[PDB]
Amino acid sequence: VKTPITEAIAAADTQGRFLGNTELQSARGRYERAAASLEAARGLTSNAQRLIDGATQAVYQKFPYTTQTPGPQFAADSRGKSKCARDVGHYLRIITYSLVAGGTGPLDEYLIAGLAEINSTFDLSPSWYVEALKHIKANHGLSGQAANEANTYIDYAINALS
Amino acid sequence: VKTPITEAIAAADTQGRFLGNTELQSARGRYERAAASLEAARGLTSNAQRLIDGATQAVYQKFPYTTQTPGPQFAADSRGKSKCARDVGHYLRIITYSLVAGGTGPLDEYLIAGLAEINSTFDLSPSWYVEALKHIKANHGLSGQAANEANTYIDYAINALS
Amino acid sequence: VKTPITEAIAAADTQGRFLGNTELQSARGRYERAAASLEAARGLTSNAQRLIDGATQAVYQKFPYTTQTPGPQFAADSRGKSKCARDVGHYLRIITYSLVAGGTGPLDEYLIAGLAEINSTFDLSPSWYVEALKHIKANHGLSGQAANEANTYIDYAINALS
Amino acid sequence: VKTPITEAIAAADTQGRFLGNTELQSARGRYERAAASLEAARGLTSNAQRLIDGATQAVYQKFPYTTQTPGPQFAADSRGKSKCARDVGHYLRIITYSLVAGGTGPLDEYLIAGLAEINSTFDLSPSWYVEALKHIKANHGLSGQAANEANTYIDYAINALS
Amino acid sequence: IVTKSIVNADAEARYLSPGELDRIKSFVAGGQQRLRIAQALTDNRERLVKQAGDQLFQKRPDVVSPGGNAYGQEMTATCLRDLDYYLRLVTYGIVAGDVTPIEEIGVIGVREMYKSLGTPIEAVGEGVRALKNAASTLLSAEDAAEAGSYFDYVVGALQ
Amino acid sequence: TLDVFTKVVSQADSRGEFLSNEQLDALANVVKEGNKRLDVVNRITSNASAIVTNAARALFEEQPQLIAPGGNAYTNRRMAACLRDMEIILRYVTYAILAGDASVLDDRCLNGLRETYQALGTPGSSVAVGVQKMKDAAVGIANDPNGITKGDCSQLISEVASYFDRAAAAVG
Amino acid sequence: MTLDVFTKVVSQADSRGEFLSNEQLDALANVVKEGNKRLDVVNRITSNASAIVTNAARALFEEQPQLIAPGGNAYTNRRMAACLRDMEIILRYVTYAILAGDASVLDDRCLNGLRETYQALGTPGSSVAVGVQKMKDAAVGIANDPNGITKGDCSQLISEVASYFDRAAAAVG
Amino acid sequence: MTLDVFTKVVSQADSRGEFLSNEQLDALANVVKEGNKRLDVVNRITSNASAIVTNAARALFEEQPQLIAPGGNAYTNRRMAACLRDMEIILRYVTYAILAGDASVLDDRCLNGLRETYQALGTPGSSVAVGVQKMKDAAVGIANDPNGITKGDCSQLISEVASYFDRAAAAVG
Amino acid sequence: ALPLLQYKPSSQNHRVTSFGAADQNEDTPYIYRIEDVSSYTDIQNIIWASYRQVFSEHEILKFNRQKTLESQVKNGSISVRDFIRGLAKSEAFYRLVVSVNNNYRLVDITLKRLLGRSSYNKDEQIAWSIVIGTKGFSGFVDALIDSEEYTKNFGENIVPYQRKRMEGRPHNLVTPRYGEDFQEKAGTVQTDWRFTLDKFYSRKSQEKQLREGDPRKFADLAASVGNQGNYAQRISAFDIDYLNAVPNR
Ligand SMILES: *[C@H](C)[C@H]1/C(=C/c2[nH]c(/C=C3N=C(/C=C4\NC(=O)C(CC)=C4C)C(C)=C\3CCC(=O)O)c(CCC(=O)O)c2C)NC(=O)[C@@H]1C
Ligand SMILES: *[C@H](C)[C@H]1/C(=C/c2[nH]c(/C=C3N=C(/C=C4\NC(=O)C(CC)=C4C)C(C)=C\3CCC(=O)O)c(CCC(=O)O)c2C)NC(=O)[C@@H]1C
Ligand SMILES: CCC1=C(C)/C(=C/C2=NC(=C\c3[nH]c(/C=C4\NC(=O)[C@H](C)[C@H]4CC)c(C)c3CCC(=O)O)/C(CCC(=O)O)=C2C)NC1=O
Ligand SMILES: CCC1=C(C)/C(=C/C2=NC(=C\c3[nH]c(/C=C4\NC(=O)[C@H](C)[C@H]4CC)c(C)c3CCC(=O)O)/C(CCC(=O)O)=C2C)NC1=O
Ligand SMILES: CCC1=C(C)/C(=C/C2=NC(=C\c3[nH]c(/C=C4\NC(=O)[C@H](C)[C@H]4CC)c(C)c3CCC(=O)O)/C(CCC(=O)O)=C2C)NC1=O
Ligand SMILES: CCC1=C(C)/C(=C/C2=NC(=C\c3[nH]c(/C=C4\NC(=O)[C@H](C)[C@H]4CC)c(C)c3CCC(=O)O)/C(CCC(=O)O)=C2C)NC1=O
Ligand SMILES: CCC1=C(C)/C(=C/C2=NC(=C\c3[nH]c(/C=C4\NC(=O)[C@H](C)[C@H]4CC)c(C)c3CCC(=O)O)/C(CCC(=O)O)=C2C)NC1=O
Ligand SMILES: CCC1=C(C)/C(=C/C2=NC(=C\c3[nH]c(/C=C4\NC(=O)[C@H](C)[C@H]4CC)c(C)c3CCC(=O)O)/C(CCC(=O)O)=C2C)NC1=O
Ligand SMILES: CCC1=C(C)/C(=C/C2=NC(=C\c3[nH]c(/C=C4\NC(=O)[C@H](C)[C@H]4CC)c(C)c3CCC(=O)O)/C(CCC(=O)O)=C2C)NC1=O
Ligand SMILES: CCC1=C(C)/C(=C/C2=NC(=C\c3[nH]c(/C=C4\NC(=O)[C@H](C)[C@H]4CC)c(C)c3CCC(=O)O)/C(CCC(=O)O)=C2C)NC1=O
Structure with a gap:
């Protein structure tokens, strides 16, 4: 699965050669940034419960019909709202997973793989989840270069949504 | 040709996706490494003429028969010694080329590609060139982390020789 | 493109043989079906203008927020409502096209090919168009076996939507 | 094996999609004619014993040397004439098989597959069997559209013979 | 020939004449042979241009003289490019049947242009005449009459 | 690929006799009962996408660890994997009702499916709890009294459900 | 591409973006009656499909006899069998054209790149269209048959059939 | 072929066969120094990659409105998804060019045979480069804009970021 | 021995995704798969359509057909990817194509028949023409079927076919088994x-x-x-200064 340490391996393995200095250099790059990436993981893990209920009530604001229309898919009764905090709470897990891995791999393999297939069948509009993630990237309270770090992977999930 | 910036491209191009944060990390690594690699290029370029004639007379020491045996291949007369400083002087060029590129690419494409084909036909024993490169890696006078930097690519040419 | 007369050809062409009685039988079936299918084409062409504005105001009922939210995709101002009757009016064209062709070919090539790509980019939820097509299949006023005929292709566009 | 119901399946299976109305239409066509094809099966089954000995003595007329020349390949003695009514009696079986199947499949799989290999080895000239089948298509006594239907498959075996 | 017939019947108040419809029918009937001539001239672009330019420099050495305009490799390359342009316009005119593509792309204001460029007109014209002779030698005989008569329009209109 | 028309040929070829008259009276009922079969298939394929998710509202709600972290339907391509081939059951069951014989069903869903389902690690028995939930919705749609002239489709209803039971037996 | 009479009157009607007019549906209604006659007619071509090809090969080679004589491109035995396979592929796609009712499936297979290979190989291209005309002389002789078919005017249909051979001869010669 | 700023100053230096000069290494030292900015520019483009394409498609089709109207080559739905499946491939390789720092990886994929297919298919070639310019107007607006970032002149990167779009528009038009 | 020179790939149809399965036309070929057996008609169609790509239909004949490799395919002992290697590295194919065509045109004709794509530019045909020369023809056919563009797109058990020719001529038809430069030598x-x-x-x-x-x-x-030759000298004749131009002694 996609990781800068893995991407050095799978490039050098398909050539059948050893680890050159060019694969070695890629590994070194992760460390400079991995020191600031683990700063972004603790910023999201400590503020996790504020961010989930901060998000799942922000999507109810912009889409008020989602709490009103009676459908299995919509979040009309409590069972949808129970599956609301599950789904949005699944996003902050994988975002924090792809932070400490350094690559988009866990985001690529757990979340966005086959997302167009599932949202068409269950009629979950992807405009809902992109509205929650814009709330997360503006309200995580992170600063410095770590604020850039979470901001890529959130925005990477945004582009894969649309 | 093989470069950590190129290796980020050819990995992301065969997948048909954009540049993720994982492709970017390899490029990021090069700048910190590349600051100490260009230190190693000036250390070899300034001491270039001392190192070539330091090497081509060191190989004559360990192999004294190479100046005595009369053959087109051997360096008996002046024409071999003229082609001596050409060949060993070609090595310090490509070593300095692979220093500033950061990868083994120019070393992989100019020097060692098809080297087993050429040394069998012209009967040039590869034990000669590995004896010159051991003289270079011990007598370049480089220090610090830059001394590690030239020491990989010299030793990478050694393993491809044997 | 997909047609029972075409499907007899492309089956017999890839085998490199003539038209057997098996290839021929499919064509024979179309004429009996095609006599009742052209009944369904005149039933939709004559009631075309009632059915479009019957549909594009039925989708505004179940989704009242689509006329209220200001967005390029949303039909808030008159521009969206101008593109409302264009899009829903495009559906009754291709449904009437696939009626007289006998196959799903024109429906497969003009309408549903790459529909998951376009609805993700422009954020057009496919739950909108399936609500208009349920209004069409219940309000075309068609009867008999011709009422079955339009009801397949409408429902075939429904399943390709979700 | 080749059948208009099968040909609808194998076309839709290689695309990986469901049964559209274009595969459905082909099935109906087979069923409708199939009412006149089973008329042709009873016309050949009831007149079966008249048609076999009507045929195997018609081929002896046009080829009188086949009962005279001494060779296993030829029908000189009674053992060839015993294998005469076997072989021509095998033809009316497969013709009646391909009648009720609606396709040329049982004719394609039981009779004509590899017929050029067998007639070259045993030196059975295919001009013999085509002379028997012309006697069958003119003396079955069938009338109407069933007369047309019975003939196609007889004439399809004729073209595969030559 | 359709544009010219339409604008000629446009100047009058009436429709297209039966004579003009016969002209359009005969032009359609000869159009496939004209496409064959265009095929040959397209595929012989290089050697026709080079032979015509070198025939020009054999006839007129004033342009490649050091007082002349086409002195030097770059200037003579632009000379051959001008001959290439005119051969391209000749192929357009052979295909269309009109000379309005030749005219409104390369004839209508060429005298004032080559006056301001310092280039002599007559040497351009002699080069297009060399193109006419070369393409006449390449093609079939009355086919070469067809090609060389459009070349003849270009030659007479340049001077 | 076999049929009702072609399988009564294929055993009749193996015995090498002409087709009997009571086999042709059997096939005459197949042509007579043929129109009903087409109608049943049409309603299944038009409600084909509506069946699969409505089976997926119960295939995952009844065994809820499957979706939950750890189960084999957990991540998103894994979830789209059991909708990619929940419909392939319907893609070949509808081929079986069209052909009228399950010999085209047993080469694709029944042949090597029980081998991959222990090679991958997926629960094989957790498929056939929901293919039964498809059959409960397939014969409900098929038996509808609306928009179709009344006729007896009992043979189709019971041996339509026999194709789902064959589809559940070779997975479980 | 594969087009029809049914699908081509859709495809231009899509390009103008209007509903199908009533006189186009009266045109297609004429076609349904015609189709039954065509199936009976097209079955006669395929049942006499192998009998046409050799009977055309009794004249395709007898009229230009150097072709099978030593030196011609139909001389050796795989070269002779090469021609027969191709000769029937004309009949394989002309019968597809009469079935579809429009020559748009004919022009992708026999008319598209056939005139390019026939100067790349070295075969006489004009010596094909002398015998495809000899196929048409035998094809419309069989289709226009008074035996075993209830008399119905098939002249309107026949004209379409004859032309497909003329399109099959024009793009080779 | 895939080249760089680091590898192209090797490749011409190999063709002349000399050691790398000190002012070439001072040139590359500025490339490493200006290197950090390059990574940032790519990051903002790829994070707003999907937002650029539709916002260019809100003007590529609104300015030439026959293209999606019946008859145009962006009319039907697969066709429409065809000029979003490769509107982004322009962005897929322009971002590869800014990463490598040299347009030699751009000219093998978007500039090599693209002008040949665009007259073989029938698509308007000039109607692409009206909207690739509309991508460049949105790409340098995002890359240039600074939010919560240290401010440094990005003119060298931006002027020659826009040079890659102008090369991407020249070989299509 | 030596690695491939890098060649530029031109933009062609098949480098593009073409999303979806339920959306493509009828005219995409039947993707005959040995895993789908169910009958012998599918078995005979898989053999016949695998001959179709290799010998362009007309040749299959009787003699060219290798009956033992088709004997094997029914058994399932050898994969279809192994079965195309038996047809391609067969001297019934050598006399038909390989001797007759050139090393530069053989690269073009075997990519359309085994990989189902035309070569991008002439540089691709130039690139593989060396790999033909030193390894032999069967060494090169081995390198085409081992190649990762083959296994990703076709796989181990799927007969080849033209990928994505939406608006293109069929490859057995546009390309003969020998071109015009060779036409005098094999033709008549x-x-x-x-x-x-x-x-x-x-x-x-x-x-x-x-x-x-x-x-x-x-x-x-x-x-x-x-x-x-070089042009005349730019320098004007008049300055020349001919009186002082002469050198004494
Ligand atoms: C027949 C009257 C003349 C003739 C035929 C002939 N052709 C060939 C070789 C080829 N024929 C084709 C033709 C087609 N390919 C297509 O895809 C289609 C449409 C579906 C057609 C009609 C092609 C591609 C070839 C090249 C090789 C091939 O078979 O795959 C031969 C063999 C010639 C040779 O092997 O050099 C012959 C004999 N030639 C004649 O002599 C007759 C005048
Ligand atoms: C250029 C068009 C715009 C711009 C850029 C800009 N960047 C910086 C500073 C930094 N940029 C980065 C980026 C990265 N470092 C990494 O390791 C990676 C992963 C490969 C990235 C993406 C960083 C880390 C720095 C400096 C260190 C830090 O931020 O922690 C500056 C100012 C600082 C500098 O010169 O480096 C600027 C100006 N700013 C604009 O306004 C332009 C539009
Ligand atoms: C680990 C990463 C991960 C996530 C996030 C995930 C989400 C996910 N949510 C689903 C359904 C759902 N998702 C929601 C959530 C919502 N719908 C609404 O109305 C609200 C707007 C919104 C929440 C804010 C609801 C209510 C369902 C049930 C819909 C149905 O049953 O049709 C489904 C399909 C059925 C299921 O198994 O429950 C998946 C796969 N799956 C994953 O593997
Ligand atoms: C750009 C990278 C590059 C290198 C380095 C290179 C070397 C190279 N050295 C060669 C020969 C030679 N190489 C040498 C060098 C030596 N022999 C000795 O006796 C000494 C031990 C030793 C020098 C220290 C000599 C003397 C010859 C000539 C031998 C002959 O002609 O047989 C040859 C074969 C003939 C030739 O063209 O001159 C090659 C290809 N070629 C390349 O393209
Ligand atoms: C021939 C078959 C065919 C159809 C049907 C089709 C639809 C289609 N509708 C579109 C946009 C649109 N579609 C709509 C329609 C709607 N949005 C709403 O708010 C309403 C709920 C709904 C109508 C009931 C609107 C308003 C736009 C413009 C949205 C935008 O510009 O972002 C677009 C993207 C931009 C375009 O070219 O105009 C396509 C491709 N394209 C096709 O080729
Ligand atoms: C189910 C379809 C089917 C058919 C029809 C069939 C025919 C068939 N007929 C054969 C021989 C034969 N076929 C004939 C028939 C004839 N020879 C004559 O002289 C007459 C002209 C003509 C009959 C009208 C004879 C006499 C033999 C025996 C020849 C021998 O033993 O050499 C043989 C080879 C030996 C054998 O097993 O008996 C086969 C395979 N096999 C099949 O599987
Ligand atoms: C399609 C219609 C068309 C024509 C005819 C045309 C001519 C043309 N000739 C030019 C120059 C030139 N043209 C010539 C021409 C000639 N040398 C001679 O003595 C001969 C008489 C003549 C060769 C026929 C020369 C020598 C130059 C270079 C003059 C300069 O650079 O100042 C230039 C300026 C540089 C350039 O853009 O190439 C133009 C535009 N352009 C057009 O678009
Ligand atoms: C709810 C239980 C039930 C079913 C299932 C049912 C079906 C049904 N379909 C019928 C007819 C039919 N059904 C079809 C259907 C089709 N033909 C085709 O070729 C198309 C592909 C396909 C539509 C897509 C046709 C063509 C007829 C002809 C008779 C009629 O118009 O009803 C009839 C007429 C009476 C009869 O057959 O005895 C019945 C009974 N009736 C019932 O009571
Ligand atoms: C696909 C399998 C199939 C075939 C082959 C088929 C043919 C077919 N041709 C028919 C009629 C006919 N077919 C012809 C054809 C002709 N008469 C002439 O004298 C002309 C020379 C020739 C046309 C060139 C005619 C005249 C009729 C009269 C009845 C009608 O108009 O359909 C009919 C009417 C119903 C019947 O005969 O029972 C059938 C069945 N039907 C099928 O289901
Ligand atoms: C990596 C380099 C590369 C490119 C660019 C490429 C393009 C390419 N564009 C295609 C089609 C197409 N391309 C378009 C594009 C457009 N329509 C418009 O109105 C716009 C002006 C324009 C896009 C901005 C359309 C509509 C089609 C489908 C045309 C048809 O099917 O008739 C096709 C045929 C179908 C397919 O996508 O496989 C290819 C191969 N292939 C390549 O390998």
């Missing part, structure tokens, strides 16, 4: 009189028809010589 354009008429007025015959002498015979030699 020498003995057919229809072509010698075309040849009679051909520009190449006029170079042959001329007697010994004329410089038009050496006109092809004059284009290959090159070496054009």
